[PDB]
Symmetry: C2
Subunit: 76 residues, 2 copies
């Protein structure tokens, strides 16, 4: 259930509860960094495919949080 | 990937420049990988550019940490 400024204070749709990590999913695609309360999210997965994401879920939490880190940089 | 040199040498190394803050963009995506060091926070911006940046390049540090806030996670 959600992390909003009410319970449905989101931007993209059509997603479910729980996936897993038994080989891949890689990149996330969120939107416009200054348009929405939030803006919206896409996940690119399990033999290069896409999913969307707002507003109550863990796997994504951890994904954001996991994705974040892999590697480091400035211009490299 | 972290602090690097040469005329491009690690999984992403394209983007290479100067935008101090966050104010307005098109879309931002973190890590198009599944397999190596490969990724960053790629930023799509206001009559273009597309950048590959993360951890070491501050403005991006803060960007991900500034924008995080803005987009969500799924269903319950």
């Amino acid at each position: 259930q959600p992390v909003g400024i009410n319970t449905s204070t989101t931007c993209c749709y059509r997603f479910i509860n729980k996936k897993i990590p038994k080989q891949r999913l890689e990149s996330y695609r969120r939107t416009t960094s200054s348009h929405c309360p939030r803006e919206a999210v896409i996940f690119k997965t399990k033999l290069d495919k896409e999913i969307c994401a707002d507003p109550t879920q863990k796997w994504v939490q951890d994904f954001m949080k996991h994705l974040d880190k892999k590697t480091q940089t400035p211009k490299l």
